[PDB]
Assembly symmetry: C3
Homo-oligomer: 161 residues x 3
């Protein structure tokens, strides 16, 4: 397997219910894959979809960190202002050490693209030796957020080990 095991969690009532396809997930996988060397040897080894439900999100983040030994978990979606956007709240429950600089850079860079970046309520942090980062559900958002992080993400992953 890879130096760094990456897992992608799509958070969406719509996708989970079979009411639409996942358009964000494949874009996240593509951005990680195409940056695999810049990330120190990272590969997406697993993806999943969960509804906008705090307990479901928490359970998968805990399993991936504590049991499956993932190194990086990117979540996609559920970061906005609607009542069903609960990804950050689930994430804050599971992380042990917050990583606000990652959120700073994602916001700073995203705002250059659209003022609507300010509506992302993303959280990020470390649980054990797993880095967890919330990204927006807009399929174009993951690429933009990953570009923002890529300069330092390899060093983040080295450090957490």
């Amino acid at each position: 397997g890879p130096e760094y095991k990456v897992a992608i969690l799509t958070v969406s009532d719509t996708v989970s219910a079979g009411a639409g396809p996942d358009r964000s997930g494949p874009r996240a996988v593509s951005v990680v894959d195409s940056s695999s060397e810049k990330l120190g040897g990272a590969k997406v080894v697993a993806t999943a979809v969960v509804p906008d439900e705090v307990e479901r999100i928490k359970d998968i983040l805990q399993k991936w960190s504590d049991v499956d030994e993932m190194d990086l978990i990117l979540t996609l979606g559920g970061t906005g202002f609607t009542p069903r956007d609960v990804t950050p709240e689930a994430t804050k429950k599971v992380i042990e050490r917050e990583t606000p600089g990652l959120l700073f850079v994602m916001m700073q860079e995203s705002l250059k693209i659209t003022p609507f970046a300010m509506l992302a309520r993303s959280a990020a942090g470390i649980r054990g030796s797993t880095l967890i980062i919330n990204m927006p559900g807009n399929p174009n958002a993951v690429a933009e957020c990953m570009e923002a992080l890529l300069p330092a993400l390899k060093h983040a992953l080295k450090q957490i080990k």
Copy 2:
């Protein structure tokens, strides 16, 4: 009434005690009114003044969100470094979901005007279907902070419903 009901809370021992007038409140009302269309049909329907006392601030934020059905609450003042600046702490107690991007944009834009922007400890978030945003007490601060938010605030208010 309006599409979006806005309420303005001035937080000030001085104003509450009758030791001076409210100079921030009218500026906040004026900025919201003059941006009413850009905000999706917002109107300030209520204002109040409370002292720099956590329980008083909490009680009004809870009443306006839970009983009076406000959609946007702007607080003015009590965000700085003095011992009596307790607005963010009261706010953090009442909000359910934090909205850090709003704080990011207010800080980013405010710092272009003055380095003293860094002394605002403002919080922001959502309780039910009410968005609550702390702004500094300086009468010129609300206009600057609202300009920073205006590009996306209509979409924020639509989403929270």
Copy 3:
């Protein structure tokens, strides 16, 4: 003594164990000293070194704030992504009122120098009449972070009193 009493806490297993010298501490003292007038009459009156241990860090921050009457505490180190970087978590336990604008400015300015700035998980806030700010352990980081804060830090210290 000075108008503002500053104390510097180096957080490092290596320095604490006698496995290397403190290179960050002297740089912090030098930057504060050389900015003493810009800070309103600040002087470093005390330094100490502790290991990367939450209880040790907490205990010194509490003693310096509650007993020794320090006005500004800068901590150096332990803000990164490694398992032993626990300074922010200790700091968050002791502070009463968070000061996110200080973190915003440090991050904003640090990112102009290096993308690795995003790996600092620094916290900051007020306990009583003591301002506590986490800075990175890189000896060059304190100078950069202090430059970012210097425009408003005098006013912060005046306010907290």
